Every structure is written in C-alpha cells, then in structure tokens.
Amino acid sequence: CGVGFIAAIDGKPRRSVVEKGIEALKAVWHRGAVDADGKTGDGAGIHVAVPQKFFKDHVKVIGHRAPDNKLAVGQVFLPRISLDAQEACRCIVETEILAFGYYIYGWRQVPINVDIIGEKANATRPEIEQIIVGNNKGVSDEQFELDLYIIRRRIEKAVKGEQINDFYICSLSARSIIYKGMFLAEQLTTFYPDLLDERFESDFAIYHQRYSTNTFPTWPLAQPFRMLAHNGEINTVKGNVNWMKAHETRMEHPAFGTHMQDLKPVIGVGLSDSGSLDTVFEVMVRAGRTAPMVKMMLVPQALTSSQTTPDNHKALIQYCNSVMEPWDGPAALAMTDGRWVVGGMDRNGLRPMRYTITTDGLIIGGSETGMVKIDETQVIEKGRLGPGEMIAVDLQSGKLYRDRELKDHLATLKPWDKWVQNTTHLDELVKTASLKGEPSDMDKAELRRRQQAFGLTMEDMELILHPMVEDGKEAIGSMGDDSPIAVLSDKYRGLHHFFRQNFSQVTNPPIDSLRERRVMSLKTRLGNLGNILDEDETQTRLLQLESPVLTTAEFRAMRDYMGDTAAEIDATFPVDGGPEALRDALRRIRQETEDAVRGGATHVILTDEAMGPARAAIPAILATGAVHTHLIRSNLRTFTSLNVRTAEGLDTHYFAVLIGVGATTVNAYLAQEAIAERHRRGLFGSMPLEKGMANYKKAIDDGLLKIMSKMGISVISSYRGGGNFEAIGLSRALVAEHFPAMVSRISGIGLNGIQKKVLEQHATAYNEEVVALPVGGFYRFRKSGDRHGWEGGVIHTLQQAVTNDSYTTFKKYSEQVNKRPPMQLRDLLELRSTKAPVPVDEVESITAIRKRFITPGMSMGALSPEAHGTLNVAMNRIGAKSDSGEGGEDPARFRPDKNGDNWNSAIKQVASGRFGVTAEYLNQCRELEIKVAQGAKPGEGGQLPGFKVTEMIARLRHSTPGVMLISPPPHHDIYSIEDLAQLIYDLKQINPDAKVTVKLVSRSGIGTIAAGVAKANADIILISGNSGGTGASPQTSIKFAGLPWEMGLSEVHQVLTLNRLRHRVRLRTDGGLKTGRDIVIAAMLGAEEFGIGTASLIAMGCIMVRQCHSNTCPVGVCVQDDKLRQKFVGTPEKVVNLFTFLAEEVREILAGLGFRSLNEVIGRTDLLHQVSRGAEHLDDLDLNPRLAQVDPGENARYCTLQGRNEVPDTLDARIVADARPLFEEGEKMQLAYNARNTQRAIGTRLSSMVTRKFGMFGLQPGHITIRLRGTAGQSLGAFAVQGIKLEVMGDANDYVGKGLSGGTIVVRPTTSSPLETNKNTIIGNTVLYGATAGKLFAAGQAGERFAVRNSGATVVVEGCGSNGCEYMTGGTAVILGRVGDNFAAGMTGGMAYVYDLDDSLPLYINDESVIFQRIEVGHYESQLKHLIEEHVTETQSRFAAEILNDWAREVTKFWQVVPKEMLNRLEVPVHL
Amino acid sequence: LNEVIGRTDLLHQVSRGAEHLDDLDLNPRLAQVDPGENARYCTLQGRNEVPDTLDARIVADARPLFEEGEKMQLAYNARNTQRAIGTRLSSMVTRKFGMFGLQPG
Amino acid sequence: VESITAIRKRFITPGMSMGALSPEAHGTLNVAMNRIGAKSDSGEGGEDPARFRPDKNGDNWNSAIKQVASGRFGVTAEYLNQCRELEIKVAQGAKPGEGGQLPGF
Ligand SMILES: Cc1cc2nc3c(=O)[nH]c(=O)nc-3n(C[C@H](O)[C@H](O)[C@H](O)COP(=O)(O)O)c2cc1C
Ligand SMILES: Cc1cc2nc3c(=O)[nH]c(=O)nc-3n(C[C@H](O)[C@H](O)[C@H](O)COP(=O)(O)O)c2cc1C
Ligand SMILES: CS(=O)(=O)CC[C@H](N)C(=O)O
Ligand SMILES: O=C(O)CCC(=O)C(=O)O
Ligand code: F3S
C-alpha cells in the first residue's frame, strides 16, 4: 500500500511528473500481499491530467479537427459480460452528455494487456472504454467540470434506476483522468500502455496501491478516487454517513442550479470508506470550496487550546468544526480540486507521509521515502507531515505553500473570529446554577422505589456510583465477566446491557485518552445543522456545551434559556395498557416529536419523569433511537437538538449508548438524586454535594472520551448517532426498525418481551413498600440472585478434584456446571450425532489432546512469581505450552533446573508497552503472540497498579519501581494492516523458528480482519471471548466490551474459509472454557487450540474473591506482597491434573459421538443443534448464522505442510553470508551495501544470529559494522543487539531501532548532500519504540512519536515530531532542536535534555509527569556534553559541532527534562 | 491469413464523406474481449465428436451382415434416452450395399 | 551493477612476508581482508599460530591463503591446515629466476 503525489511547483506540465508517478508505484510492493500467483493484487491507480496532445491527435486521426479548447474524456467500466447491458450503459452515457448539448467524438477501447491479471480479477474485470467529449458550447474550464459533474451523477443515477450492475465511471473531466485497476502497481504500465506514451505529460500526479481484508477484487474500489486518495481508514464512517443523511436535507447551493436533487444522495451504496469521503469532498469542491478548505472542513486538525496555534487558524478551525463533523481515522491523503494539489494528515498523525523538494521545481509526496530516485545533489528540502498538517501547491500560480503559510492563507479568507464570536457558549451560564446548588427533591422513600424500577442495587451504589463521586474516576475491578449474557439472564437487565461497545483491532489503532486527551473532545452544539454548502457567518449561530453531560442544575439552566423553543415528550407508558402498550407508546412519541418539530420546535426533551405506579418507563435507549431515527427518516433531525432525561441511567456505558444512538444531551437525574441521599449520611464526608456532582461529571466525561478512543475516535460529534454498538440479544427486526445501523447477528427479544420484562420489574417497585435495594451479585457472586460460572460450590469441587486427584470429583464438578440453566450461547446447543458410539480406549490419547491446550498469557506482575512459574512448569511437563504474558520473563529461567523442571515459557507475548522485549526474550521461544487485545478490555491495554511494580518487576520491565504501568492502548507500530504485516515480518526475522500469533477479540467484523491477518503471514489466530479474565481493568469493559467466542470464532472460521485462507492459519480460542464440552463445542465451531486461564488459576488456588487489583490476595495468586505470597499452595501437579481431566472428559464425549479424534470434528458444526428455549415468553435467538457451513458436504483437501507461513529474505541474507568469519572465527568486520526503501528489517536477522551465538552483549560495540548508502525501509536495525552497528549514509523510514537492544545505529545525510542537517527530517516515526539498550545517532529530525516507550536506549537527534519521548521509562534522550506538541507525556523515567533556542519548550511540553529546569548540577551538564560529542564523532554533524564550540553560552540554552517520580530516586540530585 | 484472424487492432474506423457530422460508432464491432497477449493454440482437429447409441452394438452384433452378407435378427431393449437408433446402422448399410441393395428386412 | 561487497571479493592482498614487512603491517592486511570477506596471503615466511583465532574485538589476524615456497619457512601440518587456499610459489615478477632474500638484520 501507499499514497503519493507529485507536482511541478511551477504549474507547467511535464512528462517526468508522470514518469515519476509510475516510478513510485514501482516501489511499494514490499508492503503488500504477494500472491504465489504472481499477478493478483488489491488495486492501484494513477490520477493524471487528461493529455490533450494524445487525445486531440486521436480525434484528428479519425479525421476530425482538434478543437481549440480542452477536450474531455469519460473513463468508464462497463458490464463486460452482458452486451445487452453495455448498450443500455452507453445509451445512458450518451443521452446524459447529450442533453447538456455538448459533443461526442465517440468511444475508444482502451488498450490493456490482460495477461498480467489473475483470474479472480479477470473475472470481475469490467470492459474499460473511453468516451471523448467536446466543449462545443464554448464554456469555461470551470464550467465544463461543473457540467460534466452534474452529468456523471445523472448517469450514475439512471444506471442505478435501471438496476444495472458493474457500471462505473472512474473519471470524466477535461482536467483529470484516472487510470486505476486491479493489478500490481509495479505493473500499471503493463496493463495500460497509454501511460507509456510521451504525449502523457502533466503538472501533477496522485498514485495509490491498497490492501484488503479480502481475496475478492472489485474494480471501482481501487483508488485514486476522483479528487482523493487515502492511506488509512476512517473509523468514524458510519457516523459521517448518517450525518449526511441530514446534512443533505438542507444542502442547496446555486451552482447546481435546479440540479441538486439529482445530486443526492451524495453517498451511494457499495462505496469503500475512502470512496465515500471523495464523494463528499467532491460536492463541496464542486460548489466552490478550494481543496485546502475542504481538507479542513472534513479532516480538521485538533484545536488543542494552546499557544502552539496562531489565533487566525483557531478561528477557522472553530468555524469548520461547527459546520461539519470530522471524518476521523488514520489518514494520509493526496488531494486535488482542479487547481491545487494537497498532501494532508489526520488529526493524530496516524500514517507516514514523507516528502522531498527538488532543484527542478517538483515536490514528490510519499508514504515511504526511497520511493523514487533523486540525486541528493538536487534536494532542496526533505520534510514530512505531522498531525493535522498539509502542504500544497497552487498550480495556477505555481506557488508552494507549507503548512503555516497555507493555513495563514485560509485564515485570510473570511472574518473567521468575528464570525466565530457569534456563538452562545451556554457553559458558564450552566456552571453558575450548579454552584448555586445542585438540588434534590425526592424522599429516600422514592429514590428507593424508582431505583427498584430499573432494578438497581447496593453493589450499584457502593461499587460503582460511589467511586465516581469520590475519586472522580470509574470503578476498577478484576477477574472476568462470568455472568450470563443478558438475554439469557434471569434478572432484569437494562437495554444498555445488550449493546456492546465496539472497538478497534487491526484496521485502526485506538488512542490514549489519558496521555493524549488534548486531541480529543466532547463539545456539543444545539442547532448548527444547516448548509454544509453555505459559507456565511450565519453558521455560527448555535448554543454550545462542552459535554453532552448535564447535572440537574445545569440541565434546567438550559431548558430555560430554551423555553418556547423546547418541547417535552413523555417517554412513558400505561401498564393498564395491553399487550401493545409500549409499541403505540413508541409510535406516539415518534409522532409527537414530529408535530413539535414541524410546529416550529427546536429542541426536544424526552423523559421518564412521569414514571409512576400507573406508568412504566420506556427504555430511554429505545426511546431515544426510535426518535432520532424517525427524525432522520423524515428529514427533521436537522431541525432539533434531542435531549434526554433518564431515571435508569447511572454509568459511563449508558451515556455512550444513548449518545451514539442520537442524544445530544443527557441528564442522569435519578442518580444525582441517589448521590445526594448518600451524601446526607455523610458518606462523602466533608465534601459539598456540588463538588460531588462535579466529580461525577468528570468521571462520566472521561468516561466517554474513553469508550470513544476504543475505535480511535477523537470527537463526540462524529461519534454521536453513529450507532457504534453491536446488539447481542435483541431482535433483528427491532434493531433495524429503531436504532441506527447496528448488527444484531441473532435477533433476540422484541417489544413484546421488552414490554413484559419492563413491567415486571415495575410491579416489583410499585406493588409495595421498598426500604432497601437488594444487594446485587452482578459484579460478584453473592449467594443471592445472579449466578456466575465460578461460584463457590463449583470452585470447591474443582479444587477438591485437582487436589485429591480424583477424576470422579472432576466429573461431579462439571456436572454441577453443566446442569444449570443456560447462561452462555453454547449452553443452548445439544450435541447429537449419527454414528454409534465408540469404545473410549479407541480414541486419541490424553497426551495427544492435552497438547492442544495452553495456559494463556497472564503477566508476571498481575500474578505472583510463584503462580507464574508454576504454570510454566506444568505446561512444559506435559509437552504443552504456556504464555509469558504482557510483562517480561526472567532469563535465569532460560534453563531446566536440577529437578528437571522448566520455568521458561514457550510462547512469549509482544504487547503495546513492550515490557521485557528483548533480542534474547524474543528468541527464547517457539511462538510469538502479538497481543492486539483481551476480552476483558478490548479497546485498551494493560494496567499494573504501582504497588505491584515491585523492584524485581521493575527490573524485568525496565520501568520505575513502584510507579504504575498503564500501557498504550494501541501498539505504536501497528496503525493499519500493512503495519501488522510488517511487525510480523520483524518478528519472523528476529526469530527464525517461531510461529506468530495474533490475539484478537471476538466481535462482529472479526472475520474479515481475520483474513487480512492471514494474508499478513500470521500462523495462528486467537479469538478471545468477551468474558475472559484480567488482573486489573475498569468494570465497564468487563461487562460491556467484547462478544461471546461462539460468534467471533465461527465468523473467523467462516470468512477465512470463504476466501480460501482457512488452512493457512491455525485457530485458537479462550474465554471461560472450564469444561470438557466447552472444548468440544469450540472445536466444532472451528477451533484447533483452547486456552485455559482462570480455571487454571483456581486449581492453583484462586478462590475468586476478586482483589487482584488490590495486592491483597488471600492466596498468593495475584499479589506481589511477600507475606501474602507465602500463602500460595499452587502446584504443577495441580494444574497438570486440571488438564488431564479436561482432556479425558473430551475423549469421553467424542466416543459418545462416534469420533475417535478431535480433528475429525473440527468445523463439524453439523454435530450441534440449537435447542434451548429457556424463558416463559416466546422470545428466541437464532443460532444459525453460527452453525452454518460455508461449503457444506465434501471438502477438497489443500495440502498444508508442517511449519510456519515463511517469509522473504532481506539484506540480512547476504550480510550473514558475508559474515562467515564473524561466526566462524570471531573476526571483526566492516561491510558495505546500498539500501533501498524496499529493504525491511535490515540487521534484525543478523541480530538474531548474533544473540544466538554471543548473546545480546557478548560482543564489543562495533564488532560487525555495516555501512549503507541510500534508504533503509521500515524497521531498520530493529532488535539489534550490541556488536552490530549500522551506518546509514542517506536516510530512513519508520521504526528505526524499534526494540533496539544494545546495538548501535547512526544515520546522516550524504557527505555530498547540501542539506542543513537540522532543518530536515531524516527518520520516520515510532523510532526506538520500546528499546532497552543501545545508542542511536541522527544528523536530522525525526517524526512523530520519537522514542516512544524507550526503555533504556540513548539517542541524539536534531529535532522531532510531536508526541515525543511519550511513555518513556528509561534511557537518555538528547535533542538538538524544536520539539512537537505533548512532549514527554507519561514520561515516568529516563531523562531528556533539549536544546531550545526560543524558550518555547514551555509551550509544548506535557507537564503532568515531568519537569524541566536548566542544567544546574554539573554531572548532568557533563553527561550531555559527552553525548553530543559522541553524536558529532559519529555523525560529523556541523550544527552539533558548533554547539560544542560555544558550549559556554549554549549549555545555557538546553532544558533538563526529568520525571517527577525520578527526583528522589536519583543517585546524584538534579539540583544544587 | 491466420496471423490476422480476429486481429481487429489492425482496423481503424475513419468513416468520412460529405455531410453534417452525424457519425457512427464502429467500436462495438472493433472491440477485443480479452485484449493483449494471446495463448497459442495448436491446430485443433477433426470434428466435435458425439456419443454412441445402440447402434454401436448393433453394428458389432452385425459382423456377419457386413462381412458375409448374412441376414440377422437382433433384439435389444430401448429407452427414451437412446436416440437415433438405426441411423448409424443405415450409414453402414448404405455405404456397403447402397440404399437399395438389401432386400427388405 | 553488481555490488562492491561482491566485487571486492575478487580482490586479494598478495603474499608479502612477515619479515619483509613489519608485524604490524602484515596483520593489518590480514585484518582488512577478513573484514570484507576477501582474502590475504601470508607470504613466503611463516604465520604465527596465536593468530589462529579472532580477537576480543572480532578482528581476525589469520591469513586465508598460505604460501608454500622454496625454503619452506613456517611450513607445518598446522600451518598448511589453517587456510582455504595453498599458493605454490614458483615465482615473483620482481625476481623470476630466483627466490627470496631476507637480510640478516
Ligand atoms: C489474571 C490475568 C492476567 C492476564 N494477563 C494477560 C496478559 O498479560 N497478556 C494478555 O495478552 N492477556 C492477559 N490475560 C488474558 C488471558 O491471557 C486470556 O486471554 C484469558 O485469560 C482467558 O480467559 P479465561 O480466563 O476465562 O480462562 C490475563 C487474564 C487474567 C485473568
Ligand atoms: C614487499 C613485498 C613482499 C613480497 N613478498 C612475497 C612473498 O613473500 N611471497 C611471494 O610469493 N611474493 C611476494 N611478493 C610479491 C607480491 O606477493 C605480489 O606478487 C606483487 O607484490 C604485487 O605487485 P604489485 O606490488 O605491483 O601490487 C612480495 C612483494 C613485495 C612488494
Ligand atoms: C491501503 S488502505 O489499506 O489504506 C485502504 C484504504 C481504505 N480504507 C480502503 O478500503 O480503500
Ligand atoms: O501486568 C500488566 O502490565 C498487565 C496485566 C493485565 O493488563 C491484565 O492481566 O488484565
Ligand atoms: S484475588 Fe485474584 S481472584 Fe484469584 S487471585 Fe486472589 S483469589
């Protein structure tokens, strides 16, 4: 994959611009899935100017006369198999161009060579044809495209009405034309020779290859699109899409004249995310806005409220943000309206984008940098884009604008501020009334009874509400979610329970809402929905909150300011009502809001307030959706704000759902109440009820910001109404009828059930007195109502069983377990088969089976050292495997002990904060598990409370003692699937023997990703259930993120099968598997391996008391405390017994089924039948979609060979060859080689080899040194141990020294480059990610997230993008230059100095955990000096040398950045 | 000639004469289906052949007829699935005795 | 074109004896050549066997091609075995008809 762009700064056309454009496209394949087929690829494209010589001649050769104007071309994909349709297609195409009365010189079959296409693709190949049009009407450049635009839509539309498939017009303008198709980019020129003609000349270029979650090639989905080309993904798409359904309700501009209606819907079916973007971007530009304005209105930069930003810009930004809600997601963009050409970034700089400027007056935009030869000699600059920036060219004036200067320009266009000043911030007005006193008007006798209506409890009040009020933070907890899944529940659960928060896995990264809160946002606006098409100050006239969240005080504040303008709808219904009560209720509300809005109303207030003994409340969630949708469905939502008052609301989740299913504003009124009551028994102590709410509110605000970040979304306006949930349990019909689009893969209950349950709980609370809520056993087993998997009896019996070693006791446990009411989906399945039973002896053996079992990754830290190694011993004893876990593994452990026991773990993880990740760690295993996610907390990343960060722990992890370890939610080197792809490459490079796994978490859509993972060379894929365990994690994720494995595991099984990849990868699953049958059923759904954690913990003794986060483990399982660790009685022997039983119980089952082995039953879903009905009312689920087979009946067999999906060599292949002496004799060596952007992970293999023979540190620095001219591609020197040194004279791309491990890497411009070392980029992003040792020197600037997570590498570099030194925990980080926003966020431990010539660092640095001072003590001043010296010595850097020359005056200019938590720890204090 | 069959790339449409621009689209006539390098086929030979019927046994059961001139009675079952029964017999008979050389029956 | 790594490997540093040259010069050469995967030549006069291992720094003083010349200087079962190539020296262009000299001092 890649996007790129090239432009002649002067405006004047040239052939090189195209030849370069090709040139690029020939250097991106190293980033894609190569087929063994040699031909097949996902899509490539080049968007250049229609070449009028070339075309005109053509018209001449047929013997017409060339017009004076520009001649248009339509580039069109016609149906290729039904001639009947091609015609219809061409009549339509002609008719439409005809009624604008332009002129047709006529069709031209494009030459192409289909030999380089694969069949898959030739299959879906359309018939590519050009049609040539002339501007007989003598209109203007601008009018021609305008008209053509209305024409293309007209066609587009008619073909649709005709119901014609496969028709598609890539381009149709007289300025630009697009040559895209499904073929390898390196072969664009081959599939389309026109491109090789010298008449193809152009002032600009835009190329783009693409990847996918598929095996299927659609042609129209290859880019570049008509104005756009996008690298990344736009996670905020459904959000955007539904907004346009309303934005459109009002869009009207005069340029389209009477055409608008043909103009809508601007977004047709079947578009890829980027495709939809181009769609919007286009209309906007067709109506007048420049390119750069549009990048902004749609992919605006973050308005951090800071000095970093001039005030013009801020105005503008604020303007946009008020018109259009962003289109978020990682995004490198290459854009152009007719005149300008733009390179742009998303608001988080999520994708690479280097660029070079030449003496010849060209700018070449890129994704990597070595992408197209240019002589250093003619380089005038070497830049990049950072979050939010753009760079551009105005081709009419042949002027280049860098970000500042370009943004300057746009600020210039209008009185942004004067206009912005037109908004009413009703904030202060609202805060005022709060301080004036958050009221409360119910008597406990009430609170209690309503509360009972929504089935609330003490656990609810104590466990969850309280901490919010107190700490202003939400409840953290531990252990998995073992309760039933709500539909199956026995006990009133509220709608919000069935909506699961979505989150993101490999497609895009989730953000850090702590360390990166400045880019996020919760602004809310009522009435800012008018004409995205307009550009007038009247667009700022709207009210603005700063949180959709309102305390009963603030709420009324607002509701008053509104007034005649608001309308209140009664979200409630009679109980005397009848079977259809709630239905008609839902109609009613729907209608009433209609009338209101029509009637003139501008704000709606939906509410349960009139709930009483005679009226049940309509589930706020359902009521909000029913309303918002119908509002959209009638083009009305654009006229109001929709505000909800809810008695049932209480936690963060409930807000999130409400908001994103419509809600503008929410007020949890009966909870502020419940807060008060608590407060008048002084449960909060001294603290005023007002400060009370304040906190509550922050907890819910950060609440949301988080839930959002789980699918990288930075901003509530795009999130709102986007329906980002997945419904488990409610009926298809329903979810469709009333909420935005969401999946509900098995219908579930419907209104009639909902009604019945709502009312039942109701009687509970108005049928008689209520002094206390029940206790509740949702977050914990009480011997009360809610059941759980793990309950006391069950735990005892199991313990009894593995301790006394009786299989009979085991069997009694599992029976205890299997005889209950259904609690989980698998519980609803029976296993029946058609074979007679077989004798048990005959089945496969335990030895055999237990080997398919593994003990999941549970970190050293989360668990006691004793527990951890216990597990490693058990697994190795039975020839199985265990998983180190998120947090290091002690290397002493790399040998078997006198007793023969083996503490080393067989599968090592690799997770966001790269904990103990070392060349030697990565090499002490058979398998690497890339942890993208756990079912306990999908969107997010580990926690390890500070008081667990023992010293041993801290030593392991290179973290700082007793300081907390919260991990970055996303991996920093996996922002998109190609990214995954490359990590897997490095992984397979540093360790030639291991298989690589990807931990993913079930959720709908996993299937597809699963595929991409497969194309990315992963060997195993593991789908984790929503219910798995965690040692520490917020409770909403434990109860609301994730989906059951029975759904995700089949989806992966299916989809992978459906694309013929299912044999390329092995499948594993975990999530609550405690029993023989749980394991058989998982096999039949497709699994080959099963993970067993918690139950293995319980055998080691866990009693499931849930204080894993607390460091108070009654039993030594999950606690670092010494005394407490002495109460541990786990034993290998115990765990081994657990597995032994499990397998035997598996064999017992297979025999009954007639199979003599597990393999004979994988995928065999025909052996499972869904029985269970388990409720009073006819409310059933559809378990089909899970049981279905893709290619039922006999399967063909693809031979799979034993081993791992192998990978292509790199430079290391030769380097190693050339190093015989090294390994053979010990010699020292110096090698030289060139290097291209296309060579990845250079050295890594070397390193693996060296680490293996001499170990990370048995070689003295520089022992083997390899100079490289040119460009290093991603992962340069990744995991290099000491002894290796790489000099890259030239430059590099992302991830230099990723996981650096005591090796050394240096990078400087070519002796001959005339560039000013420090005023130019030289290495990409996420450099030194997670390093632990070694040095890195860089004559130049580095890009975003430099030194992220560095845990002990020393570096020197002349500058650095934003988010630098983030989450750093060790090492020294010098920095000869300016530094990006948010520097040092979360930087708990190492040190960075920072030459700052403008005393600006103050404006950029992230205070929170760090401080800066000028050097005072002189050993710190000396430390710096020596590095800088080294730097120079290695890099021959002038600018550096000079700082050395004036040390005296200069030292004065730096700034010591030192972590708070390091102040008292530091041998030599930092101060005098 | 072979080197050029189907090669429409060798024909361009100039259609000119004296009138108003009212032109035809001769493209649909000229387009290639799978343009660009062709596979090479060897000379396919003979005729699309077809399945035997009962006649392939009657003839076998009839050696004496064709070899010695004998007169024969053959018995067989027949199904709606067997077509043109007798026609190949006829061909053989016609060729060796002509349509009228053998006495009826 | 082919790479330097590749090409430089076709280069070698001739045999110049320990004696004719300083010990420092001699081993310098052996180190250079082994560093770039090429070959050096011991020369007419022995090679010290200590030199038969790479040193703490990774440098390798041992020479890859050992000579064998008239006065068999250091010619030993172990010398002959510490290499990839044996060079029978029948003659040098400086003095074809003749054979080395090493002044007594
Ligand atoms: C205490 C504990 C620690 C865990 N630590 C990690 C970890 O370090 N890395 C990880 O990728 N998943 C971790 N997990 C999840 C497990 O690896 C596995 O996905 C899940 O534990 C199994 O769920 P089950 O508990 O119902 O047996 C942890 C889970 C628990 C309960
Ligand atoms: C100082 C010196 C020492 C030499 N010693 C030997 C030697 O020991 N054995 C040998 O076979 N040739 C010897 N030669 C010759 C070289 O091995 C090689 O044949 C010739 O040096 C290369 O000539 P060129 O000097 O113009 O580079 C010696 C030459 C020189 C200059
Ligand atoms: C190379 S790419 O993975 O960024 C593809 C971009 C986009 N989401 C698409 O589906 O086309
Ligand atoms: O130990 C750690 O860093 C993480 C452990 C963890 O996140 C979990 O077990 O839920
Ligand atoms: S608190 Fe974790 S619950 Fe198990 S580990 Fe101790 S009993």
UniProtKB/Swiss-Prot annotation, chain A:
One Pfam family this chain carries?
Glu_syn_central
Q: For FMN, which residues are the binding ones?
A: 1049-1106
Instruction: Supply the InterPro entries for this chain.
Output: Aldolase_TIM, ET-N_metabolism_enzyme, GATase_2_dom, Glu_synth_asu_C, Glu_synth_asu_C_sf, Glu_synth_centr_N, Glu_synthdom, Ntn_hydrolases_N
Instruction: Write out the ranges of the annotated region (Disordered).
Output: 880-901
Question: Compositionally biased, Basic and acidic residues: which spans?
Answer: 890-900
Q: Which PROSITE patterns match?
A: GATASE_TYPE_2 (PS51278)
Which reaction is the catalytic activity of this chain? 2 L-glutamate + NADP(+) = L-glutamine + 2-oxoglutarate + NADPH + H(+)
Q: Where is the Glutamine amidotransferase type-2 domain?
A: 1-396
Give any GO molecular function from the UniProt entry: metal ion binding
Family from the record = Belongs to the glutamate synthase family.
User: What name does UniProt use for this protein?
Assistant: Glutamate synthase [NADPH] large chain
Q: Record the organism.
A: Azospirillum brasilense
Curated annotation (Swiss-Prot), chain C:
* Family named by the database record: Belongs to the glutamate synthase family.
Q: Which residues of the full protein are shown?
A: 879 to 983 of 1515
Q: Can you state the subunit structure given in the record?
A: Aggregate of 4 catalytic active heterodimers, consisting of a large and a small subunit.
Remarks, miscellaneous = Glutamine binds to the large subunit and transfers the amido group to 2-oxo-glutamate that apparently binds to the small subunit.
Q: What is this protein called?
A: Glutamate synthase [NADPH] large chain
Q: Which residue intervals make up region (Disordered)?
A: 38-59
UniProt lists compositionally biased (Basic and acidic residues) regions at 48-58
